[PDB]
Write a protein that binds this ligand. Structure first.
Ligand SMILES: *[C@@H]1O[C@H](CO)[C@@H](O[C@@H]2O[C@H](CO)[C@@H](O[C@@H]3O[C@H](CO[C@H]4OC(CO)[C@@H](O)[C@H](O)[C@@H]4O)[C@@H](O)[C@H](O[C@H]4O[C@H](CO)[C@@H](O)[C@H](O)[C@@H]4O)[C@@H]3O[C@@H]3OC[C@@H](O)[C@H](O)[C@H]3O)[C@H](O)[C@H]2NC(C)=O)[C@H](O[C@@H]2O[C@@H](C)[C@@H](O)[C@@H](O)[C@@H]2O)[C@H]1NC(C)=O
Ligand SMILES: *[C@@H]1O[C@H](CO)[C@@H](O[C@@H]2O[C@H](CO)[C@@H](O[C@@H]3O[C@H](CO[C@H]4OC(CO)[C@@H](O)[C@H](O)[C@@H]4O)[C@@H](O)[C@H](O[C@H]4O[C@H](CO)[C@@H](O)[C@H](O)[C@@H]4O)[C@@H]3O[C@@H]3OC[C@@H](O)[C@H](O)[C@H]3O)[C@H](O)[C@H]2NC(C)=O)[C@H](O[C@@H]2O[C@@H](C)[C@@H](O)[C@@H](O)[C@@H]2O)[C@H]1NC(C)=O
Ligand SMILES: *[C@@H]1O[C@H](CO)[C@@H](O[C@@H]2O[C@H](CO)[C@@H](O[C@@H]3O[C@H](CO)[C@@H](O)[C@H](O)[C@@H]3O[C@@H]3OC[C@@H](O)[C@H](O)[C@H]3O)[C@H](O)[C@H]2NC(C)=O)[C@H](O[C@@H]2O[C@@H](C)[C@@H](O)[C@@H](O)[C@@H]2O)[C@H]1NC(C)=O
Ligand SMILES: *[C@@H]1O[C@H](CO)[C@@H](O[C@@H]2O[C@H](CO)[C@@H](O[C@@H]3O[C@H](CO)[C@@H](O)[C@H](O)[C@@H]3O[C@@H]3OC[C@@H](O)[C@H](O)[C@H]3O)[C@H](O)[C@H]2NC(C)=O)[C@H](O[C@@H]2O[C@@H](C)[C@@H](O)[C@@H](O)[C@@H]2O)[C@H]1NC(C)=O
Ligand SMILES: *[C@@H]1O[C@H](CO)[C@@H](O[C@@H]2O[C@H](CO)[C@@H](O)[C@H](O)[C@H]2NC(C)=O)[C@H](O)[C@H]1NC(C)=O
Ligand SMILES: *[C@@H]1O[C@H](CO)[C@@H](O[C@@H]2O[C@H](CO)[C@@H](O)[C@H](O)[C@H]2NC(C)=O)[C@H](O)[C@H]1NC(C)=O
Ligand SMILES: *[C@@H]1O[C@H](CO)[C@@H](O)[C@H](O)[C@H]1NC(C)=O
Ligand SMILES: *[C@@H]1O[C@H](CO)[C@@H](O)[C@H](O)[C@H]1NC(C)=O
Ligand SMILES: *[C@@H]1O[C@H](CO)[C@@H](O)[C@H](O)[C@H]1NC(C)=O
Ligand SMILES: *[C@@H]1O[C@H](CO)[C@@H](O)[C@H](O)[C@H]1NC(C)=O
Ligand SMILES: *[C@@H]1O[C@H](CO)[C@@H](O)[C@H](O)[C@H]1NC(C)=O
Ligand SMILES: *[C@@H]1O[C@H](CO)[C@@H](O)[C@H](O)[C@H]1NC(C)=O
Ligand SMILES: *[C@@H]1O[C@H](CO)[C@@H](O)[C@H](O)[C@H]1NC(C)=O
Ligand SMILES: *[C@@H]1O[C@H](CO)[C@@H](O)[C@H](O)[C@H]1NC(C)=O
Ligand SMILES: *[C@@H]1O[C@H](CO)[C@@H](O)[C@H](O)[C@H]1NC(C)=O
Ligand SMILES: *[C@@H]1O[C@H](CO)[C@@H](O)[C@H](O)[C@H]1NC(C)=O
Ligand SMILES: *[C@@H]1O[C@H](CO)[C@@H](O)[C@H](O)[C@H]1NC(C)=O
Ligand SMILES: *[C@@H]1O[C@H](CO)[C@@H](O)[C@H](O)[C@H]1NC(C)=O
Ligand SMILES: [Zn+2]
Lengths: 499, 499
C-alpha cells in the first residue's frame, strides 16, 4: 500500500523510498521545453509571441522580458542534450517553431532549409543518447503573418495552413519522431489570448482591457477553441492516414486542473465544481471523446457556441492516440454570476464559478506554488493529490486513454541569487510529491500513464513573467547563457531516475 | 564672394561668419529622424526591420542592437519637441511607422486608432512650437505581413497597399502636414535589401551571402526599384488629385553622392564616374524627370531592367513637387568589370565602377567620416564641396527642382564616454562645412534649395550599426533614455539658427 503526503514537510525526496524503479520498467522520465521560450529569434521568422511581447511589453513580464535571445537553444541545443544525458532521461518534450521552418506561414511560400536542419540535428542528437523525442507542433508561436492575414485561429483558414505545416513536420522528422503533440494546452489560447488578453495575440473586448487592438471576450474564445479542435483533428487525420508507416502516435495537450468544492456541504459550490470540470476539461474532452461539447456548455453558451457538422464531429471524435496532460494545480470552486449582457463579459464567466486556493473554512489547499507580490491574496497553492484525481477522472470519464504527463513543475523567484536558485528544495518537494501520487494512481486505479516530463529542462522565458521566475531543473545565468547547471532538483531527479 | 573650406581645420563654426541669416529669410532649418530608429515597438505591429534584426542579429549591428526600445520616442515624443524648441528649429523630418497605424499592413484589415493619435499629438505639438513637419511615409519599415505575403516591394501588390496607407496618412494628417516624403532613399532598399542583403529584408543570391533566405542580387534590385517608383508615383498622383485642397507638397527622397574620377586624366575613370552618376542618381531621376531609365542602364542591364508602359511612364514622369535630397559623402570612381554570368553578380556591378575615398595619386578626398575598425582601408571620408556639386548637378541635369536637404550628418563612435560624446567638434565641422557650401551653391548657381534638416535630432538605433555609433545633435544615455541633451553640435546649431 502506497501512502503519499499532501502537506509539508515532504519526505519523498529520498530516493530510497521513491525512484524510477517504483514505476513500470518502460516508463519514460524526462523534461520539457518550448521553442519560443528557449531558442531565440535568430534564424526564424516572427511569430505572435514576438509581436505581443513587443507591442505590449508590460504584458510580456514585469521585466518586459521576451524570447529574443533567452537561453539561446538555437546555439546551445547540444548543451540541452547534455543536460538530458546527465539526467539519464529517456524523454524530452520540445516544440518546433512554425516560424523557424515556414517563416512565411503558408507552406507554398517556401520552407527554411536551415530551420529544418536545426531540428534534424537536435532530433538526431537526442536519439543518439537514447532519448525519446515528444514533439509539440504548436506551442503558441503562430507566425505573425497568419495573425495579420486572417487573425490566426480566429479564422477557419488556420486549418489548412496548420495542416500543411504539420505535413512538413511529419515528412521531415517523422522517420525519427514517434510521439507528436498537436496544440499545447488547448484551453489557454482561447481564454488568455482571446478572452483576458494576457497572452498573444492579445485580443479582448474593449472594456476588458482597453489596450487590446480588437476582439470580443464573450465570443472569440469559443471560435478559437472550435478552430483549434478542427485544426488538431485535421492534423491527426493526416497523420493517421498518410504517415501510418512511421509507427508513431499523436495527441493533443490539455492543461488539467482538479477542482474541489469551496464548500463541500454546499450544493451550489458542488455544482460549480462540476461545471468547472465540464467548462475547463470537457470543453475539449467532450469533442475529443464524443464529437460534441458538454451539454452544460451547449445550454449556457447558447448561440455563442459553434456547432460541429456531422463530418466535423466524426473528424474530431477519437482524434488522439494518447493525451498529453499538463498538470500544475487544483482550485476550489464556488458559484459566481454569469453577466452575459455586461460589456466586460468573458467566456470564462460562463462556467458560473469563482476559483480560489482557500476553502470556505479557511483551509489553503496545499503548499505555496507561486507568490504574487502585488496581491498576496492571489498567491497560488498546489495540491499533490490533484494529479491522482485528474488521472483517475480521465480514466473513468474519458474512456481509459493512454496518457503522458507532458508538463509538471514549479517556479522559484528570479529575485533569488544563484546560490539560492540552485538550492531549489521547494522544487524537489513539488516534483516528488506529485510523482508519489502519480505512482499511487497508476497502481491503485490502473490509469494508463506511460511517462512523465517535468517542466522545465532549464530556466527560460516564462510566458507572462519574463525572467522574473525560474522553472528549470538546470540553472541558466542570464549574463552568460551557455551553461545549464543542474540545480539540487536536477541532481535529485538524476538520482530518482538512476537510483 | 563666398569662400568655403574643404580641408581641416574648418573655421565655419563661428556664427559671426556663418549663420542662418546668411540664407534667405524663409529658409527652413531643423533636424531629422525615422520611426524605426527612435520609437520602439511598443504600440505597433512588427515590420521587416524588426524581422531582419531579429532573424539576422549580426546584421543589425556589431552589438546586435535593434529598434525594440531605442530612445523611446513613443513615450518621449514631447522631449523631441523640446529639443526642437531649444534649437528654435523651423523644420522637423520624422517618419510614420506603417506598422503603427496599420499593423496588419492592408488598410481594409483595420487601423490602429491609438497609433493615429500618437502622430496627431506629435504633429499638433510641433505646429504649436512653430515647427514645420516634413513627414516620411515610408522609411524602410514595411509591415512584416506584407513581406511574408508577397515579399513586399518585390511584388506589384505593394503598389495598392502603399497607396491605401498613404491615403490614410493624407486623410488623417494632411490638414496639418504640408510636406510629405514618399520613400526614403530610393537607391537603398533595392541595393542593400535585395542586392547585398546588408539591410532588411535581407534577400540576395546564395553565393553573395549564404545566410539570405532567398533572392537574386542580379535581378531583384531592379524589380524592387521599379516597384518603388511605381508605388511612389501612384501615391503622388493620389495626393495631387485627391488632396490638392490641403495645399501641401510631396516628393521622393534620394540618397545623393557626388562622384569624381579616381584618375582625372584617365578616360576610363572619367567614364566610370559618369556611369556612376547615371546608375546611382539617374536610376531614379531618369524615371522621375523623363519616364525612362538612363540609356546606359537600358544598354547594360538589358532584359534585367523592367520597362514602363506608356501609362506608367506618364505616371512616374514629373511625380514630385520637390525632391528631398539626402547627402553624406562623395566617392572616386574607377573602372571595374561587370561579370553578369558570375553566380555572385549583383546589380551594383552593372555600373562598371569601383568606388574609393582615395584617388590614384593617393589623395584622400577629405576628412574622416566613418572609421572602420575591422578594415581601416575601408574608412569613409567626406567632401564638403560635394553638396555644392550635387545641388548644381540637380539644377542643371534635372530641370531646376525645388529641393530640401532632408539629411546631412556624421557619426561619432559609441565607444566614446559621455563627455567625449558631448564634445562633438567633429560634427560641428562636418555640419558647418556643408552648410557653407550649401549657401555658396544657392548664391552662385541659384539652386532652389529651401531648407536643411540635419541627421539626427538625437542618438538613435543606426541601421546596420546598432548603438555602436551616434549621429545625434543631442545625446541619449542608453541606460536611461528619457533626456535628450544638446551636444556641442546642438549648441552650435542653436546659435547658427538664432545668432
Ligand atoms: C454525445 O454525442 C451524442 C450525439 O452524437 C449526444 O447525444 C445527442 O444529444 C443531443 C442534445 O445535446 C440530442 O439532441 C437533442 O435532440 C432533441 C431530439 O430531436 C430529435 O427528435 C426531435 C426531438 O423532439 C427533432 O426536432 C430533431 O430534429 C430530432 O428528430 C432536440 O430538440 C435537441 O434540440 C434542442 O436542444 C439543443 C441543445 O441541446 C439546441 O441547440 C436546439 O436548438 C434545440 O433547442 C437536441 O437536438 C440537437 O439540436 C441541435 C442540432 O444542432 C443537433 O443536430 C440536434 O441533434 C441528440 O438527440 C442526442 N443524439 C443521440 C443520437 O442520442 C450525447 O449527449 C448526451 O446524451 C444525450 C442522450 C443527452 O443526455 C445529452 O444531454 C448528453 O450530453 C453526447 N454525449 C455527451 C457525454 O456529451
Ligand atoms: C526620354 O524619354 C524619351 C522617350 O519618351 C527617350 O527617347 C526615346 O529613346 C529611345 C531609346 O531609349 C528611342 O527608342 C528607340 O527607338 C528606335 C527607333 O524606333 C522607332 O522607329 C523604329 C526604329 O528603327 C521601330 O522599330 C520602332 O518601333 C519605332 O518606330 C529603337 O530600336 C530602339 O529599340 C532598340 O533599343 C532598345 C534600347 O534602347 C531595346 O530595348 C529594343 O529592344 C531595341 O533593341 C528604341 O526603341 C524602344 O525600344 C524598346 C521599347 O520598349 C520602346 O517602346 C522603344 O521605343 C525612342 O525612339 C525615343 N523616343 C523619342 C520620342 O525620342 C529619351 O531618350 C534619350 O533621347 C533619345 C533621343 C536617345 O538619345 C536616347 O538614347 C536618350 O536616352 C529619354 N531621355 C533621357 C534623358 O533618358
Ligand atoms: C457550508 O455551506 C453550508 C450550506 O450552505 C453552510 O451552512 C448553512 O449556513 C447558513 C448560513 O450561511 C445557515 O443558514 C442560516 O441559519 C441561521 C439559523 O437558522 C439563520 O439565522 C440564518 O438567517 C440562515 O438561514 C438562511 O437564511 C437565508 C434563507 O434563504 C435560507 O433558507 C436560510 O437557510 C444554514 O442553516 C446552514 N445550513 C446547514 C445545513 O447547516 C455552512 O455555513 C457554516 O455552518 C453553518 C451551520 C453556520 O454556522 C455558518 O455560520 C457557517 O458559515 C458553510 N460552511 C462554511 C464554513 O462557510
Ligand atoms: C592617370 O591615368 C593616366 C592615363 O592612363 C596615367 O598615365 C598613363 O600611364 C601609363 C602607365 O600606367 C603610361 O603608359 C606606359 O608608358 C610607359 C612609357 O612609354 C611604358 O613603358 C608602359 O608600358 C606604358 O605604356 C602603355 O602600356 C600598355 C599599352 O596598352 C598602352 O598603349 C601603353 O600606353 C601612359 O603613357 C600614361 N599616359 C599619359 C598620357 O601620360 C597616369 O599614370 C601616371 O603618370 C604616367 C605618366 C606614369 O608616370 C605612371 O607611372 C603614373 O602612374 C595615371 N595617374 C596615376 C597617378 O595613376
Ligand atoms: C460580442 O459579440 C456578440 C455577438 O455578436 C455581441 O452580442 C450581441 O450583441 C449584439 C448587439 O447587442 C446583440 O443584438 C445580440 O443579441 C448579442 N448576441 C448574442 C449572441 O449575445 C456582443 O455585444 C459583442 N461584445 C462586444 C463587447 O463587442
Ligand atoms: C538571377 O535571375 C536570372 C534571370 O532569371 C538568372 O539568369 C539567367 O540564368 C537563367 C539560367 O542560366 C539563364 O538561362 C538566362 O540567360 C539568364 N537570364 C538573364 C536575364 O541573365 C540568374 O541565374 C539568377 N541568379 C541566381 C544567382 O539565381
Ligand atoms: C527504489 O524505491 C523502491 C520503493 O519504490 C525501493 O524498494 C528500492 O530499493 C529503491 N531503489 C534504490 C536503488 O534505492
Ligand atoms: C501597460 O501598457 C498598456 C499599453 O499597452 C497601457 O494601456 C497600460 O496603462 C499600462 N499598464 C500599467 C499598469 O501601467
Ligand atoms: C495525403 O497525401 C496525398 C498526397 O498528397 C493527398 O492526396 C491526400 O489528400 C492527403 N491526405 C489526408 C489528410 O488525408
Ligand atoms: C466589470 O468586471 C469587473 C471584473 O470582471 C468587475 O469587478 C466590475 O464590477 C464589472 N462591472 C460591471 C459594470 O459589471
Ligand atoms: C560564459 O560561459 C561559458 C561556459 O561557462 C564560458 O566558457 C565562457 O568563458 C563565459 N564567457 C564569459 C565572457 O565569461
Ligand atoms: C541509465 O539508466 C539505465 C536504465 O535504468 C541504467 O542501466 C544505467 O546504469 C544508467 N546510467 C547512469 C550513468 O546512470
Ligand atoms: C551672420 O553671418 C553674416 C555673414 O553671412 C554676418 O554678416 C552677420 O553679422 C552674422 N550675424 C550675427 C548675429 O553674428
Ligand atoms: C553571422 O550570422 C549568419 C547567420 O545569420 C552566419 O551565416 C554568419 O556565419 C555569421 N557571421 C560571422 C562573421 O560570424
Ligand atoms: C480618389 O478618391 C475617390 C474616392 O475614394 C476615388 O474614387 C478615386 O479613385 C481616388 N483617386 C486617385 C488616386 O486618383
Ligand atoms: C565573387 O565575388 C567576390 C566579391 O564580389 C570576389 O572577390 C570573388 O573573386 C568573386 N569570385 C568569382 C568566382 O568571380
Ligand atoms: C532617468 O532620467 C530622467 C531624466 O534625467 C530622470 O529624471 C530619472 O530620475 C532617471 N531615472 C533613474 C532611474 O535614474
Ligand atoms: C527664434 O527665431 C526667430 C526668428 O529668427 C527669432 O526672432 C527669435 O528671437 C528666436 N528665439 C530664440 C529664443 O532664439
Ligand atoms: Zn526584440
Amino acid at each position: 500500500e502506497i501512502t503519499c503526503q499532501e502537506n509539508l514537510p515532504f519526505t519523498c525526496g529520498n530516493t530510497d523510498a521513491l525512484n524510477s524503479s517504483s514505476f513500470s520498467s518502460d516508463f519514460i522520465f524526462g523534461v520539457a521545453s518550448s521553442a519560443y521560450q528557449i531558442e531565440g529569434t535568430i534564424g526564424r521568422g516572427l511569430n505572435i509571441w514576438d509581436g505581443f511581447t513587443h507591442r505590449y511589453p508590460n504584458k510580456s513580464g514585469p521585466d518586459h522580458g521576451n524570447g529574443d535571445t533567452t537561453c539561446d537553444s538555437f546555439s546551445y541545443w547540444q548543451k540541452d542534450i547534455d543536460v538530458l544525458d546527465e539526467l539519464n532521461a529517456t524523454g524530452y518534450r520540445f516544440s518546433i517553431a512554425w516560424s523557424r521552418i515556414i517563416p512565411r506561414g503558408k507552406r507554398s511560400r517556401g520552407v527554411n532549409e536551415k530551420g529544418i536542419d536545426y531540428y534534424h540535428g537536435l532530433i538526431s542528437g537526442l536519439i543518439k543518447k537514447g532519448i525519446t523525442p515528444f514533439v509539440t507542433l504548436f506551442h503558441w508561436d503562430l507566425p505573425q503573418t497568419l495573425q495579420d492575414e486572417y487573425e490566426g485561429f480566429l479564422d477557419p483558414q488556420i486549418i489548412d495552413d496548420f495542416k500543411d505545416y504539420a505535413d512538413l513536420c511529419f515528412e521531415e522528422f517523422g522517420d525519427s519522431v514517434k510521439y507528436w503533440l498537436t496544440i499545447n494546452q488547448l484551453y489557454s489560447v482561447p481564454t488568455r489570448g482571446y478572452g483576458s488578453a494576457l497572452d498573444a495575440p492579445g485580443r479582448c473586448s474593449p472594456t476588458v482591457d482597453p489596450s487590446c487592438y480588437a476582439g470580443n471576450s464573450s465570443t472569440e474564445p469559443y471560435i478559437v477553441a472550435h478552430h483549434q479542435l478542427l485544426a488538431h483533428a485535421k492534423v491527426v487525420d493526416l497523420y493517421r492516414k498518410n504517415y501510418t508507416h512511421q509507427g508513431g502516435k499523436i495527441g493533443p495537450t490539455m492543461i488539467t486542473r482538479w477542482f474541489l468544492p469551496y464548500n463541500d456541504t454546499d450544493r451550489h459550490s458542488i455544482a460549480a465544481t462540476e461545471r468547472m470540470k465540464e467548462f475547463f476539461l470537457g470543453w475539449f474532452m467532450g469533442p475529443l471523446t464524443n464529437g460534441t461539447y458538454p451539454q452544460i456548455m451547449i445550454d449556457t453558451v447558447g448561440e455563442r457556441l459553434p456547432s460541429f457538422s456531422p463530418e466535423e464531429s466524426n473528424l474530431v471524435k477519437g482524434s488522439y492516440d494518447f493525451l498529453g496532460l499538463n498538470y500544475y494545480f487544483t482550485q476550489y470552486a464556488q458559484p459566481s454570476p454569469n453577466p452575459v449582457n455586461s460589456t466586460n463579459h468573458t467566456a470564462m464567466m460562463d462556467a458560473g464559478a469563482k476559483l480560489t486556493y482557500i476553502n470556505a473554512s479557511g483551509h489553503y489547499i496545499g503548499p505555496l506554488f507561486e507568490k504574487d507580490k502585488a496581491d498576496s491574496t492571489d498567491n497560488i497553492y498546489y495540491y499533490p493529490k490533484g494529479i491522482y484525481s485528474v488521472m483517475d477522472y480521465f480514466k473513468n470519464k474519458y474512456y481509459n486513454p493512454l496518457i503522458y504527463v507532458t508538463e509538471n513543475g514549479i517556479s522559484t523567484p528570479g529575485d533569488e541569487n544563484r546560490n539560492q536558485s540552485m538550492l531549489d528544495y521547494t522544487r524537489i518537494d513539488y516534483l516528488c510529491s506529485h510523482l508519489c501520487f502519480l505512482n499511487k494512481v497508476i497502481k491503485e486505479k490502473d490509469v494508463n500513464v506511460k511517462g512523465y516530463l517535468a517542466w522545465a529542462l532549464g530556466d527560460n522565458y516564462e510566458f507572462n513573467k519574463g525572467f522574473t521566475v525560474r522553472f528549470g531543473l538546470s540553472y541558466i545565468d542570464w549574463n552568460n547563457v551557455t551553461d545549464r547547471d543542474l540545480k539540487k532538483s536536477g541532481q535529485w531527479y538524476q538520482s530518482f531516475i538512476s537510483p
